Structure formats: structure tokens, C-alpha cells
């Protein structure tokens, strides 16, 4: 299979700075016609992708000059001379040289801000849900940065990963932070087999994890 590898996958940037996105293919994109069908798309939230650069370096209609594409063979690069708010979104390289045509995984250009520790809150199953036979233990890790974070669940001191579902919000339009929800789903009977429930957050803002717990009592 022809693999398109973009790097980095996430690219924090301050408005006004230069940004560079790499895209490498597992095999040459030089088509037998002599042309190189390597293209770049930009996709903003809720919108369909839009063509930015076609055939390595040709700027598409309406694309500002701060965008420039270069490279050849298996190595390509997209550069933004001075990032503006409207440039934030997800960039995809795409090749039309070898069927099946393929896309890179996408590089997310996002607004950089100071690192911020998450505010962690844990919640025991409501009495209402228990009455229904279920038991969801919820944990909110809010307004932190960067988005990279590790959440561990511990029941009576033992790590539990099965039955855990996580959900992440998109970067906040106001404070540029991220938030996530983690839920340990259990049957009412499983919940009653243990007492201590803990939500642990590991984030680069601290060498020690943030621990929030409660006792089924």
C-alpha cells in the first residue's frame, strides 16, 4: 500500500510565526506521465476540505502567497510564512499518482498558549442510575494545555482500563484550552464489589499525577 506520512501530526503555532508541514510517501509520487500529483488540502471545522496547492507547488485559486509547496519524489513540504487565524485547521497531503489514491493522516495547525494543568473532578454514580441497574463513574479533566494527557482509573488501588470511554472537546475558541471526559462504565453489581474509585491525570504540567477519588462508602 502507498503510505503518506505527515509530520508533525499536531502543530501548535503562534499567529505570525512560520509553520512547516512534512509529507513523505512510501514510494515516489512521480507519475509515468512525468508529472507529480501531490496536493495539499486545508480543512476547517464543519467544512469540506479545500484545495490549497496542486502538483507540489502550484497555488490554487484564491490561495495567498504565504502558502508555498515544495519537494519531489517522496519528500514534500508545505510552508506558511506567517500564520493567520484563518489558517488554523487540518492540513492534508494527497496523492493522485497511484491508485488507490491516498491521503496523509492530517496535520492539525492549532493556536499555541501557555501550558495549563487540568482541573479534575470525579463523580460517583447518581442514585437515579443505580436504581436503574447501572453505574457510571465520571471524571472531567477541564481546560488544560497541551491536549496530550493520560487518564488512569483505579478501583481499590488496581488499574482498570476495560469499560472506560473517553471524549475530548476541540480547542476552546476563547482560552485555547482542551477538556476531556472519562467514564468508567460498570454494572451495579461490579460497582458494589469495590469501595475506592480514583481518577488519575498525568499531564506535562506536573511530575506527579492529579488524583481525585471517592469511596462508595
Amino acid at each position: 500500500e502507498l503510505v503518506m506520512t505527515q509530520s508533525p501530526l499536531s502543530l501548535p503555532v503562534s499567529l505570525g510565526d512560520q509553520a512547516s508541514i512534512s509529507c513523505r510517501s512510501s514510494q515516489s509520487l512521480v507519475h509515468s506521465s512525468g508529472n507529480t500529483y501531490l496536493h495539499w488540502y486545508l480543512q476547517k471545522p464543519g467544512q469540506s476540505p479545500k484545495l490549497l496547492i496542486y502538483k507540489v507547488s502550484n497555488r490554487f485559486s484564491g490561495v495567498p502567497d504565504r502558502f508555498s509547496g515544495s519537494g519531489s519524489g517522496t519528500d514534500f513540504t508545505l510552508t506558511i510564512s506567517r500564520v493567520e487565524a484563518e489558517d488554523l485547521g487540518v492540513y492534508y497531503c494527497f496523492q493522485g499518482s497511484h491508485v488507490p489514491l491516498t491521503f496523509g493522516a492530517g496535520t492539525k495547525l492549532e493556536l499555541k498558549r501557555a501550558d495549563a494543568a487540568p482541573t479534575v473532578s470525579i463523580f460517583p454514580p447518581s442514585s437515579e442510575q443505580l436504581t436503574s441497574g447501572g453505574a457510571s463513574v465520571v471524571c472531567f479533566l477541564n481546560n488544560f494545555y497541551p491536549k496530550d494527557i493520560n487518564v488512569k482509573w483505579k478501583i481499590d488501588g488496581s488499574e482498570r482500563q476495560n469499560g472506560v470511554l473517553n471524549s475530548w472537546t476541540d480547542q476552546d475558541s476563547k482560552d485555547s484550552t482542551y477538556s476531556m471526559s472519562s467514564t468508567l462504565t460498570l454494572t451495579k453489581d461490579e460497582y458494589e464489589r469495590h469501595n475506592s474509585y480514583t481518577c488519575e491525570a498525568t499531564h506535562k504540567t506536573s511530575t506527579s499525577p492529579i488524583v481525585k477519588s471517592f469511596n462508595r462508602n
Binding site: 469540506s48 484545495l51 489514491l101 460517583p124 472531567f140 471524549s167
Partner: protein, 217 residues
């Protein structure tokens, strides 16, 4: 003039059944440009499915060729997409996009049509209040569980409490959706002042107003 492509799809499809989408174009002729089909899902990113060139011949992504069919009617400016034996992970946004002649790049995209592959029936959500354990800001929550289809709308205090709110993307659990929402207010305002989670589920014509009350040891 204004090169436009518009997808017309079913929305919801049951697994094992088929998916038929019609792409209607205007501003250009199908006899002059090819039309690609691409889909996007969180689990597989952007995937190229196939294309029907201006001349009428097609090319398919080998991973789908066993169940994918693309055809067109030049006179009616319509391109037809049909995929059989649908499965859960075929859930995605499907797009038709014009091929930019000899650049072999998609230049004009439709807005896309969202397709959900599910055997679920319309089901209202169970709404559970999330109050901190019995044992300065205070974060409260709301768990919206087991509903179908998306979306549900969660608000706080009938919309009077909009700042400090985080409503997380829903996750699939047992063919049904589950999501949570958190709200953070001054600890001096709760529980002295009421805080209620308001959940609306258009599809089931239901609304639930759940007051967040403190727990009692």
C-alpha cells in the same frame, strides 16, 4: 460560473444493507470532468473510494471494489454512488468532488452527506445529575445516556448559565449514544442557588430538566 456539487443521501442505514447517494452537479459538465467520492470518519480519516472519469470509465479503491458501484447520467448532471453490505465503520461523511482535469486533484467539493450505519431505533436519553461526592469554584455534571439518534442538546439553567460549560462529544456504547456535560460555577452560588441540566432530544421529542442536588454521606 459557480461549480457546485451536492450529495443527496439516506442519512441512516442499517448494517448489511446498502447506501445510495446521488451527487448532483451544476456549473460544469460531467462529460468534461471526472467526479471522485471520498469519505471521512474519525477512525480512518479521509479515504478515497473511487471515481468516474469524464469519459465514463471508473476506478475504485481495491478495498471497496467488491461492494462499491459508481455510475452517472451525463444528461442529468448526476453521479450515482452505491455501496452494499454496510457495516458500523462505514459510518462517515461521504463527499463527491470534482476532479481538476490533468492535475488529478479534487478542486470542488460537495458539503458532504452524513451517513450513520446503525440498527438502533429512536430512543430518548436517560438523564443523570452529577454532583460531587458528599466528602473557589465547584464543577457539576450531567450524564446523558443511551439515546439515538444524535444529536441531543444540553443546556444549563435553561440557557441562562452558558459560561464555564463543557459539553463533550458523544461516544457509542451498545448501539446507543452517551455524552456528558460539565458546568463550573462559584461555590458560593451552588447549592445555595439552583443549577439544572436541561436536555433536549429532538428525534424523540423529549426534554428533561434535571436539578443538580448535593449528596448526603
Amino acid at each position: 460560473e459557480v461549480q457546485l456539487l451536492e450529495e443527496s443521501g439516506p442519512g441512516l442505514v442499517q448494517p448489511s444493507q446498502s447506501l445510495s447517494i446521488t451527487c448532483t452537479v451544476s456549473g460544469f459538465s460531467l462529460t468534461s470532468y471526472g467526479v471522485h467520492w471520498v469519505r471521512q470518519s474519525p477512525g480512518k480519516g479521509l479515504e478515497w473510494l473511487g471515481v468516474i472519469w469524464s469519459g465514463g470509465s471508473t476506478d475504485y479503491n481495491a478495498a471497496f471494489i467488491s461492494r462499491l458501484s459508481i455510475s452517472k447520467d451525463n444528461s442529468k448532471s448526476q453521479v450515482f454512488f452505491k455501496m452494499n453490505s454496510l457495516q458500523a465503520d462505514d459510518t462517515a461523511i461521504y463527499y463527491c468532488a470534482r476532479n481538476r482535469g490533468y492535475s488529478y486533484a479534487m478542486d470542488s467539493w460537495g458539503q458532504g452527506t452524513s451517513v450513520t450505519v446503525s440498527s438502533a431505533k429512536t430512543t430518548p436519553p436517560s438523564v443523570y445529575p452529577l454532583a460531587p461526592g458528599s466528602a473557589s469554584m465547584v464543577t457539576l455534571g450531567c450524564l446523558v445516556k443511551g439515546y439515538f439518534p444524535e444529536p441531543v442538546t444540553v443546556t444549563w439553567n435553561s440557557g441562562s448559565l452558558s459560561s464555564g460549560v463543557h459539553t463533550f462529544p458523544a461516544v457509542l456504547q451498545s448501539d446507543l449514544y452517551t455524552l456528558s456535560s460539565s458546568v463550573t460555577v462559584p461555590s458560593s452560588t451552588w447549592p445555595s442557588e439552583t443549577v439544572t441540566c436541561n436536555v433536549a432530544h429532538p428525534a424523540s421529542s423529549t426534554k428533561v430538566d434535571k436539578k443538580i442536588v448535593p449528596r448526603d454521606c
